C-alpha cells in the first residue's frame, strides 16, 4: 500500500503533445520500480546518472514523470546534449540529467487511418529552449523580414505542426509514448523511496 502512481502516467488513456508535455510530481510514497520493467517491452529504456535496478534501494526528495508523444525517429533526441526540432523547440534535457527515459511504440493506440492530428510539435521558434522549459504560446511566427502584427498569412505562420499519425507509416514515423523520469535529491528529507 501507498505506492507511487506510475499507472496514472504510463497507462494514461491520452498522452500530451510534446510541445505541451505533461509533468507529474511523485512524492510521499513507496516507488515499486520493478513493475515498470515487468510492465511492457519498452522499445527504449536509457538511464543517466543511475542504474534502474538500484532505484528500489534509493530515496529521493521528488520524482518527476514527463509524458508526451513524438515519432520513433525523434526518441534519440530525448537524451542530454542532443539537437533536432524536439530537443531545440519542444523538450530539452540538461547535460547533467539524472533519470530515465522510457519509450514505447503506441501505433495501435495513437495512430489513426486518415491521421491522428491531436499530436503536435513546435515547428517554428525564435530561439532554443533552455533545459526543462515548456513553450505553449501559439503566437504567429514571423518568417519574413516584414512584421506579422499577430495576423496569420503569407510569411507569417502558426508555430505548431501536427504529426497526423497513420498506421501505415514506417516504424520511424510512428507514434511513441515517452515517459522521462527525473530523480531529485534536495536539502530536505527524501520522501520517495524504493521498497526496503
Amino acid at each position: 500500500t501507498n505506492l507511487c502512481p506510475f499507472g496514472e502516467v504510463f497507462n494514461a488513456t491520452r498522452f500530451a503533445s510534446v510541445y505541451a508535455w505533461n509533468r507529474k510530481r511523485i512524492s510521499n510514497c513507496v516507488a515499486d520500480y520493478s513493475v515498470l520493467y515487468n510492465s511492457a517491452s519498452f522499445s527504449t529504456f536509457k538511464c543517466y546518472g543511475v542504474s534502474p535496478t538500484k532505484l528500489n534501494d534509493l530515496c529521493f526528495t521528488n520524482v518527476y514523470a514527463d509524458s508526451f508523444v513524438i515519432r520513433g525517429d525523434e526518441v534519440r533526441q530525448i537524451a542530454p546534449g542532443q539537437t533536432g526540432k524536439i530537443a531545440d523547440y519542444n523538450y530539452k534535457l540538461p547535460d547533467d540529467f539524472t533519470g530515465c527515459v522510457i519509450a514505447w511504440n503506441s501505433n495501435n493506440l495513437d495512430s489513426k487511418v486518415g491521421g491522428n492530428y491531436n499530436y503536435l510539435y513546435r515547428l517554428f521558434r525564435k530561439s532554443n529552449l533552455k533545459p526543462f522549459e515548456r513553450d505553449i504560446s501559439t503566437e504567429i511566427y514571423q518568417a519574413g523580414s516584414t512584421p506579422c502584427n499577430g495576423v496569420e498569412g503569407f510569411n507569417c505562420y502558426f508555430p505548431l505542426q501536427s504529426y497526423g499519425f497513420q498506421p501505415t507509416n514506417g516504424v520511424g514515423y510512428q507514434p511513441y509514448r515517452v515517459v522521462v523520469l527525473s530523480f531529485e535529491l534536495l536539502h530536505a528529507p527524501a520522501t520517495v523511496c524504493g521498497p526496503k
Partner: antibody, heavy 121, light 111 residues
Framework: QVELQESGPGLVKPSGTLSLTCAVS?????????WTWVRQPPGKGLEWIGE???????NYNPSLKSRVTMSVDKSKNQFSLNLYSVTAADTAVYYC??????????????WGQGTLVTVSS | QAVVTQPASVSGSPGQSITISCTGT?????????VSWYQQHPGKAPKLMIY???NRPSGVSNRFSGSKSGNTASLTISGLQAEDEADYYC??????????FGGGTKVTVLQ
Amino acid sequence: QVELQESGPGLVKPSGTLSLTCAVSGGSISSNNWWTWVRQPPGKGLEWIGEIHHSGGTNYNPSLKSRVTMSVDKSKNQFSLNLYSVTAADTAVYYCTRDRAGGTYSGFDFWGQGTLVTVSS
Amino acid sequence: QAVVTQPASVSGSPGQSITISCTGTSSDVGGYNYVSWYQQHPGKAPKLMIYDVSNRPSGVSNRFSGSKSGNTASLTISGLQAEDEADYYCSSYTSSSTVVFGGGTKVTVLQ
C-alpha cells in the same frame, strides 16, 4: 456556440443519390475535429457512417465504403455526405456530429437536429 | 463491422440505481479505452454523457458513472429520476479506425 444544421432533400428515388450538407456555425470547419455523419433508421439504433478532416482525411463504415463520399467546403464552412445507389434500407434520420478531437474516437460532443431522409419510389 | 451488445431494456424505480452493460470484442471495447455513452430522448439528437470510459462532459449529472472491465463497458445511473427514461447507446473505436455503436437500451422509470 458551435451549432450544426443539416440540409438536403427529404426524398430520394431508389438507386439514386443522397446528398446532405451540414452547416457549421460558431466555429470554423478547419478546427482539429473529425466531422462525422451518423444515421438512425426510424425506431432502430444508431449507425456511424464516416468522418472527414479539413486536411482531407476520410474514414467510412466498411459496411458502406463502396457507395459513400464526404467533402469539405472551407469557403462555405460546411461538410457534405453523398450516399450513392440508395435502397429503402437507407431510409433514416441523418445526423451531422463531430468528435471532441481530431484523433482516435473521443466521443461526439455537438450534433445537428437530424434530417429525415425517405428513400421511396 | 463489430457487434456491440447491450441489454434491450433496463427498468428501474425512482431513486434506485441501474447498470447498462455494453459487451464487445478485443478489437473494440476491450482493446481501447475510447468508449462513449449517449442518452437519447425521443425525437432529439443523442447527448454525450460519458467519454473515454469514465469522463463526463461539463454539465452532465454526476449520477452517470462510466466504467469498463475486460471487454465490457458499464454505464451506471444512480438515484434515477424520471427524466433519465431514454435510450442509452455505448460506442467505441475499432482496430479498423472506425466507430461502432451498441444495440441501444431502453431505460424505463416506473410511473
